[PDB]
Design a protein around this ligand. Structure first.
Ligand SMILES: Nc1ncnc2c1ncn2[C@@H]1O[C@@H]2COP(=O)(O)O[C@H]2[C@H]1O
Ligand SMILES: Nc1ncnc2c1ncn2[C@@H]1O[C@@H]2COP(=O)(O)O[C@H]2[C@H]1O
Ligand SMILES: Nc1ncnc2c1ncn2[C@@H]1O[C@@H]2COP(=O)(O)O[C@H]2[C@H]1O
Ligand SMILES: Nc1ncnc2c1ncn2[C@@H]1O[C@@H]2COP(=O)(O)O[C@H]2[C@H]1O
Lengths: 201, 201, 201, 201
């Protein structure tokens, strides 16, 4: 009940904000649908809760919640459990809506994403669409090359993703160099399919 | 109502603080007028609200709220939308009152400002006033040269501005080098009109 | 009463979170036992409280609370009081449960621990268990070598520990170089007993 | 009333904390006296309040509250107003009680202090006490030399001081080099009186 009240109290402050700034009706509707999909009638203060625990508890929790994701990603399903845990521990759950530009080509990237559920489209400047779904990840190439996004990525459907900041990406990969190279191999091949090559990889 | 109550509860803590420290009447009046102009009877916890959303939503929101500003600035009205978005996303709304010294000459600057509504006066040490208003920006030269403010800037009227920290200024400009040079061209000419020249530009 | 209510209100948000994410029964039971052991029916906002005080008060407080620990550690019981205080001031109280992997071999360490009460087991990859208890500390070697954890450490019983971040470890040791070397001497000998040697030490 | 209630609610959480950790009676009494002297029956959330204002307002406020201090310090009373403002803006009000060791010789310093009201004693390792009061400042030498505290400083009476972090000390002094040298001149002479000399100064 307390968490349900929290959700309602929050959404109310959100509605009032939108009304104050007079956001268009269709946008208010999108926000409504976003809150519905992202929090599903409940609001928690995770930072506060998880912060009251300790390393092991928090690690056991994240591993439990991400079982499916871990099971659908070739990358983690075979890797060192400590690697996965190190990665899982830094993930931020996010939800994007149909048509959202999650990543735009030519810009500098600050994060990468892991797909738990949903379908996205990888779009290059020269057209050419490639779909990605459950178990796949995207947005890693720029983090590896420290260059620019090599393509755009749109949400085709609602997308439940887990993102990893560029800083946390480097921290874990600095500790597990073999996973970095695994990311490189996949990346080199990906760039090759979109007519690109980068010596950095 | 909740946001209106928030505004009232806040102002009350503000009044009590001023009374405790015994700020002069005229200052208490200025504070009253400031809160009135800045929050206009409503208080929101933007950090909390926007933080519950995601990249796209937040970007759509800021773009909506800043339509006019974007439309009155030659700088953004022609630029890459992703540039504008990158810039808009880092702006902090602020309000200054008539007679306020927004920038003082000879000091190190930590931010620049974009004028949404209001008129300011650019004042040099050797006297000479130049007015700036809606659509213009100021405080950029020091950020570019990493030197000192080349002039003072006073609020002539109430001023509704959007500020950009020195750190965010460098981050976006590091990504969009052509906008940096555009800022330079305008700056070189501005310095020239106040009898100054800087090789850094 | 207020602190007791806080504890109850917190645990309730914790239970609701676990229910939302559907954590297994046995895990919910572990969480229950954790909160019981860690907070013992009371919840305080230390950051807020201690933050209202000043250096001396806070230092006197931590010294009082850690009398026993200080008295059971050869390391501090003989050291400069200002050293101990510098160390105590940066400690974070934590509680781990039986079977928890506090430290895993081969990973990068971010902290070290001081044992106030409890018994842990130091386990090497080649098997070989060594017990550590009240008065002892562990997890320091990696901080000194900037290498990898040279062994794993499991909680044998409930463990009431005080941890020290890698950053605070370097700050205090940079100020008290002789304590660093004391840590080194013990470390060199410890590595030697697990068939290891590091020139860095 | 709201601020008065805040003070009472806070102190209550403080009393409960001390009771939980069982701090000695005399210490609980010192804490009582500390809260009485430091907050004088009122608790405000300055960070929140001042944060709602802007540069000018906040600067006018701090300048008002620190009029006396500014008027009793040879250092600021003659300096550039923008320098004083830059300094005042970074000060943290603190209160120390009789007998407190504000600074201990031989340790690394992280801040300096300005005396608004109270008397302290500068004590060297070789004995020798020198009193300092209203208008004077101390704890600056270590910040300038990046060395160690060259003496200890005890509160003789209750002391109402304004402290300046080492980071803010460098920021302002990097902008006003002539004030740094003024600090140096005084420092060189101070060290000379306690039988010390440092080429860094
Ligand atoms: N050929 C490809 N197949 C699938 N995904 C790709 C391909 N090329 C690029 N991508 C993804 O598109 C993303 C765009 O941003 P990044 O360059 O960070 O990382 C890129 C990859 O994650
Ligand atoms: N000739 C000018 N015309 C308009 N604005 C100016 C002129 N010269 C300087 N300025 C502005 O005055 C500001 C003072 O601070 P900055 O040096 O950061 O940046 C300067 C410009 O924004
Ligand atoms: N021989 C030993 N006896 C006791 N403790 C040890 C021994 N060897 C290693 N350790 C501890 O095991 C810890 C594993 O992590 P660290 O390498 O950080 O630090 C190590 C020491 O704290
Ligand atoms: N001769 C002196 N007279 C007054 N104050 C002094 C004298 N010598 C040192 N101090 C102060 O004692 C402080 C001890 O810490 P610091 O070295 O940071 O800075 C020192 C000065 O602020």
């Amino acid at each position: 009940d307390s968490s349900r009240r929290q959700y309602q109290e929050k959404y109310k402050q959100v509605e009032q904000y939108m009304s104050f700034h007079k956001l268009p009706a269709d946008f208010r509707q999108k926000i409504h649908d976003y809150y519905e999909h992202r929090y599903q009638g409940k609001m928690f203060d995770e930072d506060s809760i998880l912060g009251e625990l300790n390393g092991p508890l928090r690690e056991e929790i994240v591993n439990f919640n991400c079982r499916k994701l871990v099971a659908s990603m070739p990358l983690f399903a075979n890797a060192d459990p400590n690697f996965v845990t190190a990665m899982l521990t830094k993930l931020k759950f996010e939800v994007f809506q149909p048509g959202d530009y999650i990543i735009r080509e030519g810009t500098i990237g600050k994060k990468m994403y892991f797909i738990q559920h949903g379908v996205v489209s990888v779009l290059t400047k020269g057209n050419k669409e490639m779909k990605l779904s459950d178990g796949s990840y995207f947005g890693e190439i720029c983090l590896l090359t420290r260059g620019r996004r090599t393509a755009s990525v749109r949400a085709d459907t609602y997308c439940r993703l887990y993102s990893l900041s560029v800083d946390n990406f480097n921290e874990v990969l600095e500790e597990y160099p073999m996973m970095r190279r695994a990311f490189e191999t996949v990346a080199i091949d990906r760039l090759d399919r979109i007519g690109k090559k980068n010596s950095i990889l």
